Write an enzyme that holds these catalytic residues in place. Sequence first.
Site, short mmCIF file in Angstrom:
data_model
loop_
_atom_site.label_atom_id
_atom_site.label_comp_id
_atom_site.label_asym_id
_atom_site.label_seq_id
_atom_site.Cartn_x
_atom_site.Cartn_y
_atom_site.Cartn_z
N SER A 1 -30.67 37.74 42.03
CA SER A 1 -32.01 38.78 42.49
C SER A 1 -32.40 38.19 43.95
CB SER A 1 -32.96 38.57 41.44
OG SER A 1 -34.05 39.50 41.78
N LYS B 1 -28.14 42.39 47.77
CA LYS B 1 -27.31 43.25 47.40
C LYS B 1 -27.38 44.69 47.78
CE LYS B 1 -27.32 42.20 43.29
NZ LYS B 1 -28.30 41.23 43.40
N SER C 1 -24.94 40.92 37.72
CA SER C 1 -23.84 40.76 36.85
C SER C 1 -23.61 39.17 37.05
CB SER C 1 -22.51 41.53 37.47
OG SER C 1 -22.49 41.69 38.88
#
Lengths: 182, 208
Positions: A12, A16, A85
Amino acid sequence: QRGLTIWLTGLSASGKSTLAVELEHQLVRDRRVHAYRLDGDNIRFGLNKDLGFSEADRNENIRRIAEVAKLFADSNSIAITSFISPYRKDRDTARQLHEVGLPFVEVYVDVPVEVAEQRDPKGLYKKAREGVIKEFTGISAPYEAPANPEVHVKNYELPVQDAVKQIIDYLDTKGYLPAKKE
Amino acid sequence: STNITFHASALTRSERTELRNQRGLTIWLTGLSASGKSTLAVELEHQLVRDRRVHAYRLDGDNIRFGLNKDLGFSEADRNENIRRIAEVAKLFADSNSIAITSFISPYRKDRDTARQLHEVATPGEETGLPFVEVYVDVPVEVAEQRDPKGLYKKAREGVIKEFTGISAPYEAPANPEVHVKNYELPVQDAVKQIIDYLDTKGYLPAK
Ligand SMILES: Nc1ncnc2c1ncn2[C@@H]1O[C@H](COP(=O)(O)OP(=O)(O)O)[C@@H](O)[C@H]1O
Ligand SMILES: Nc1ncnc2c1ncn2[C@@H]1O[C@H](COP(=O)(O)OS(=O)(=O)O)[C@@H](O)[C@H]1O
Ligand SMILES: Nc1ncnc2c1ncn2[C@@H]1O[C@H](COP(=O)(O)OS(=O)(=O)O)[C@@H](O)[C@H]1O
């Protein structure tokens, strides 16, 4: 246009989504391809609004996202996914779903926990340290780093454009994109 | 923020079409098994892509029920969930600026209404929702039964397949679909023309 999935994985606040936005922007404008981003905002409040963060729910979150990315790739779009993921088995299941085929380009958006924790845009790392949020990836839940990502972005003290260039350059070595527009 | 309809908005025809054509839309086919939904979807995609040059993608049992929804059966609850998930996926395709075409029985009015609502709502940060065109592919059950190569209606009447739509589970016919196609004694191209003509009344497609 041949479709494929660009699968971002990382902690986190590793960057991304920011990377996905710029990547989509360059792909659409400079290469003229169709691309669509799957991220927390359009998946976890809709298709996966029934899921939380237990291990089982993350397994299901990723399972569903991988099937949806495969549909976008099958439709001849480039699906760009931006989910932590954290489990390697689920990323591998996602890869197999595509390869058994559609290209699956795993991009490890890599920052050490320290860097993500100093960014902590929503204050979640602090809550995780305080025990207010349980099982938080990197603090109290695992992040299984990819063993063999197609692209490894050391995404700290690095301009987003350099990170995106690294991804686009990789896609070109494989011939996945049309020539750059003049 | 509070949503209103295009009618209530006072936007003009050019303004309405410009705004709702910024992204894509979903064409939701509903009807009995073997009413012809997937057949119409294939022809509809063919004509749209061929003659109008738009992007379209079909969602059907073959690409959804053995993948994303492989964990779901045919119980009422599983059909509610099957349709909820499909609707969310069709919404992603519409958001991506493609025409999503879906071919699922979607027997329950409440689920089709949930599917419609999640498309039509203008969520915080967007100024408009996405169009949802419900198409009732209507045939009498006797006609669907004559289109049964796999003998599913036969198995349903014999009790081999329980709760089979139209025989031992209900099909709630759409009361107000955007398009109502009586898909029998009518070639497929005619049914598709009915759908495309409707899309053109709304200005959703590039000029012929
Ligand atoms: N290359 C970068 N350098 C410094 N900060 C970045 C970089 N990329 C993204 N960020 C910042 O880090 C935070 C998290 O980025 P985000 O893209 O939302 O991460 P993720 O999607 O991995 O959770 C944001 O405040 C963002 O502006
Ligand atoms: N327990 C938690 N662990 C990790 N992220 C969490 C947690 N709780 C909330 N989040 C938020 O949810 C985002 C991660 O969601 P996903 O990428 O969908 O996770 S994943 O693990 O299931 O892939 C984080 O960036 C953070 O905003
Ligand atoms: N009990 C059942 N009722 C209706 N169709 C069934 C049933 N069991 C299997 N099927 C098959 O599954 C198809 C319907 O699947 P869906 O369209 O996905 O159904 S829905 O009701 O959940 O929308 C039928 O065309 C038939 O091939």
